[PDB]
Structure formats: structure tokens, C-alpha cells
Amino acid sequence: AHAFWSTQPVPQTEDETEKIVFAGPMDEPKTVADIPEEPYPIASTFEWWTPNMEAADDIHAIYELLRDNYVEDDDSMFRFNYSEEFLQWALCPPNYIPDWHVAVRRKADKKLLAFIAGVPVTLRMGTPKYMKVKAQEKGEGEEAAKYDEPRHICEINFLCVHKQLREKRLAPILIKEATRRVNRTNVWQAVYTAGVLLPTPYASGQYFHRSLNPEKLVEIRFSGIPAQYQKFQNPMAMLKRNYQLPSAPKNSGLREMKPSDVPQVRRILMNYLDSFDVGPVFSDAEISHYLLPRDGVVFTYVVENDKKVTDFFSFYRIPSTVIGNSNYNLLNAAYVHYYAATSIPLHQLILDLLIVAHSRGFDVCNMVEILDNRSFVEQLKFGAGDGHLRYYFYNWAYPKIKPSQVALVML
Numbered sequence: 234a235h236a237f238w239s240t241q242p243v244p245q246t247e248d249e250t251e252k253i254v255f256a257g258p259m260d261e262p263k264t265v266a267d268i269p270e271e272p273y274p275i276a277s278t279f280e281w282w283t284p285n286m287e288a289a290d291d292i293h294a295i296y297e298l299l300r301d302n303y304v305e306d307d308d309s310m311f312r313f314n315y316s317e318e319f320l321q322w323a324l325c326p327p328n329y330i331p332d333w334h335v336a337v338r339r340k341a342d343k344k345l346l347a348f349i350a351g352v353p354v355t356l357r358m359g360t361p362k363y364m365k366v367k368a369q370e371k372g373e374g375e376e377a378a379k380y381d382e383p384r385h386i387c388e389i390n391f392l393c394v395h396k397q398l399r400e401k402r403l404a405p406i407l408i409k410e411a412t413r414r415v416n417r418t419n420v421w422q423a424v425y426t427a428g429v430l431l432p433t434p435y436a437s438g439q440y441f442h443r444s445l446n447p448e449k450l451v452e453i454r455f456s457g458i459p460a461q462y463q464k465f466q467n468p469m470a471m472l473k474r475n476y477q478l479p480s481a482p483k484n485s486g487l488r489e490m491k492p493s494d495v496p497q498v499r500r501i502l503m504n505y506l507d508s509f510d511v512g513p514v515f516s517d518a519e520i521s522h523y524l525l526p527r528d529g530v531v532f533t534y535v536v537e538n539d540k541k542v543t544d545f546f547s548f549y550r551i552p553s554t555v556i557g558n559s560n561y562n563l564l565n566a567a568y569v570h571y572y573a574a575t576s577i578p579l580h581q582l583i584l585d586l587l588i589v590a591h592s593r594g595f596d597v598c599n600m601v602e603i604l605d606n607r608s609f610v611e612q613l614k615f616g617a618g619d620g621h622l623r624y625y626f627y628n629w630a631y632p633k634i635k636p637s638q639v640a641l642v643m644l
């Protein structure tokens with residue numbers, strides 16, 4: 234059933250997953266010296282290319298590949314259109330490794346055919362709380378604690394094969410080469426997400442959406458007018474009223490984050506993320522990188538009153554190409570990123586996220602049911618969407634956890 238995934242160090246079934254009780258490696262690691270120095274073999278007419286994702290023309294080349302060939306819905310109405318600025322941001326965090334950005338080009342015509350990217354992440358990925366209790370109940374605490382310390386691993390994203398090259402087994406070649414480059418830096422796990430089901434997730438969450446411009450969403454067929462609204466004389470007017478938001482934020486002291494806020498935002502975020510079983514650890518440089526505002530890309534606000542930052546939220550932008558509509562070309566989506574609340578309830582903080590995103594021209598706000606995102610879904614009028622975001626590890630046995638135990642936002 235899986236000619237590639239059955240050869241890799243990942244749990245193969247839910248039955249196998251059910252038996253895993255401690256975090257730890259699937260394959261005990263070899264060493265860097267065991268790993269082939271040369272690139273994996275590839276057809277003599279293709280070639281490996283490492284783009285420089287800080288050089289505007291290489292970022293452009295990868296942007297076009299994704300624009301035209303990255304994730305689309307099944308009805309081919311929308312295709313992700315991650316921006317050049319977003320790609321530089323996402324792919325070049327502190328201490329990134331350029332050789333983890335892996336592309337394939339056609340030699341003749343130098344056509345870009347495929348891409349995959351890895352970035353460093355420091356991840357807490359030790360045995361989860363409910364399995365540590367089960368280990369205590371049986372006298373197995375030290376085996377359960379072995380990998381408690383945060384681990385320096387790879388996060389994988391942006392796997393893409395050109396539409397003309399689909400179903401030719403090029404994705405396993407990209408994955409094997411990326412795994413070799415990561416292993417040659419002495420890293421032996423990765424984390425990745427996908428909307429598709431592969432062997433075998435350690436967590437799964439539904440997607441949720443909050444309409445900000447319902448008229449546009451219905452015009453482009455992202456949304457429909459729900460049947461309940463047909464009993465009104467003006468169904469669209471009532472749908473707009475249902476989703477209407479204030480025109481300015483309600484929390485006193487909300488302002489954009491600035492460099493001087495990095496230590497306090499790091500402290501409150503890390504204290505909050507500690508409560509989840511799987512979650513990132515960020516240095517001050519990584520809090521700067523992932524959270525300071527960047528036009529068009531990431532938007533972050535703090536609540537500061539009386540000279541103290543007590544709360545913050547962030548969101549990032551990913552537009553989608555709208556294929557074939559004579560009134561709009563783009564779906565402008567805001568995605569809930571990290572946040573922490575110490576002075577106000579989460580729904581009160583996140584209401585200001587929706588207000589700011591709507592004021593800035595976003596059409597919808599999206600998130601998955603990770604972190605404490607379930608705690609504000611009803612009041613803030615999120616609804617579950619179709620499908621599910623699955624979280625995976627490469628070369629890590631992990632007991633299944635609920636998505637409310639996941640604190641890693643995947644871009």
C-alpha cells in the first residue's frame with residue numbers, strides 16, 4: 234500500500250502506534266560518518282540545486298513553483314500563494330541551514346521541477362503527560378523521562394512537485410535527499426504536518442474558519458449562505474450582520490510589538506507553552522524572528538498597560554489564488570499564530586485579533602484546534618471546516634496525543 238512510506242522509520246499502523254508508550258527513536262541513530270557524502274542519485278537529466286532563500290531571484294524562482302503547483306483544494310478553486318517575503322521569513326530563521334533547502338531542476342531548460350525545505354526547531358517531544366502517569370503507575374518513570382529535554386530537530390515544509398511531473402515517484406527522491414542532508418548535520422528526527430493521511434500521525438486536529446468578509450467568501454465560493462439564513466428577506470444582509478466586528482480594538486493598551494518587548498513576550502509565551510506536551514522552545518533571537526511585525530507577513534500585538542506587557546497575539550498572512558472569478562483574484566487569509574494571555578480571557582484577546590485582521594482587509598481567519606484554540610471557537614463564531622491537519626514525526630515513536638496537547642504552529 235505504501236511503497237515508500239513502508240521503507241521509512243515511522244510507525245506503520247494505528248495498531249503499532251497504540252503499543253508505543255515512551256518517546257524515543259524508531260531507528261537508533263548512526264553517525265554522520267555513516268551517511269553517504271554524495272547526493273542521492275537522480276536521473277542523469279535532472280540536477281540537485283540549493284537555492285539561496287535570502288537572494289531575491291532565488292526566492293522568486295521558488296515562489297513561482299509554489300504559486301503554480303502548491304496545495305489546491307479538490308475542486309481546484311483555490312491554490313496557496315505564499316509570498317516571496319513570507320518564504321524568506323519562514324525558511325531563514327536564526328541558525329537556519331542553507332543546505333536543507335533542496336530543489337530539483339531540469340538540466341536542459343533549467344526548469345524548476347520540485348522543492349522541499351527544512352528549518353531547525355527546538356522541540357519538547359518527550360513522553361506526554363498522560364503516558365508519564367501510566368509509567369509512574371507501573372514503576373517505569375526513568376524510561377519515560379529519557380527524552381524530556383528539548384531536542385534540536387528539523388521541521389519540514391513546502392514539499393512540491395511540478396504538476397507535469399506528478400506520480401513519477403519524485404517526492405520520495407526529494408524526501409530521501411532532504412533526510413540525507415539533515416542526517417549529515419547529526420539531526421535524526423523531523424516534524425511535519427499534512428492535510429492528507431500518511432503512516433502515521435501522532436495527533437490530528439480539525440481546521441476552523443471565522444468569516445471576516447462573508448460577501449466575498451460567498452462570491453468566490455469559499456462559503457455558501459447557510460440554509461438557516463434563507464428564512465430571511467435578505468439572507469446576505471443577515472449573514473453580514475452575524476459576522477460584523479468592531480472597527481477598532483477593544484483592549485486598552487493594545488499596540489504593535491517592538492524589539493524591547495522580546496524578553497517579556499518570550500517569558501509569557503514559554504511559560505504558557507510549557508503546559509502542552511509537544512511545543513517549541515524559542516530563544517530571544519527566535520522570538521524576534523517569528524513574532525516581530527513584518528509587513529504583509531506577520532502581525533503581532535501586545536497588551537501593555539501601566540508599563541507592563543501582560544498578553545500578546547500574532548497572526549500571519551497566506552493569500553490563495555482564486556482560479557477564474559471575474560470579481561476577485563485572491564483570498565486573503567489570516568492564520569492564528571502564537572499568543573499568551575495573563576490579564577484577560579483568551580476570547581477577549583482573540584476578539585482583537587479578528588478586529589485587527591478585518592480592519593487590515595483579511596477575508597477569513599483560520600486556525601487548527603491546537604493550543605487553547607477550542608476555548609474561543611463558539612463565542613467568536615469559528616466553525617469547523619472540512620478535513621484535518623495531521624502532525625507527524627520522522628524517526629520518533631510517540632504515543633497518540635490530543636491536538637489540545639500540541640503547541641507547534643506549522644506555517
Ligand SMILES: CCCCCCCCCCCCCC(=O)SCCNC(=O)CCNC(=O)[C@H](O)C(C)(C)COP(=O)(O)OP(=O)(O)OC[C@H]1O[C@@H](n2cnc3c(N)ncnc32)[C@H](O)[C@@H]1OP(=O)(O)O
Binds near residue numbers: 234389390428431
Ligand atoms: C531526519 C530528517 C528527515 C527529513 C524528512 C522527513 C519526512 C518529510 C516528509 C514530507 C513532509 C511534507 C510536508 C508538506 O509539505 S505537506 C504539503 C505537500 N505538498 C502539496 O500537497 C503540494 C501539491 N502536491 C504535490 O506537489 C505532490 O502531489 C506531492 C509533492 C505532495 C507528492 O508528489 P506526487 O503526487 O507526484 O507523488 P510521487 O509519485 O512523487 O510520490 C508518491 C509518494 O509520496 C507520498 N506523499 C504524497 N503526499 C505526501 C505528503 N504531503 N507528504 C509526504 N508524503 C507524501 C505518497 O503517499 C507516495 O508514497 P507511498 O504512499 O507510495 O509510500
Ligand SMILES: [Mg+2]
Binds near residue numbers: 398400401403404
Ligand atoms: Mg513525481
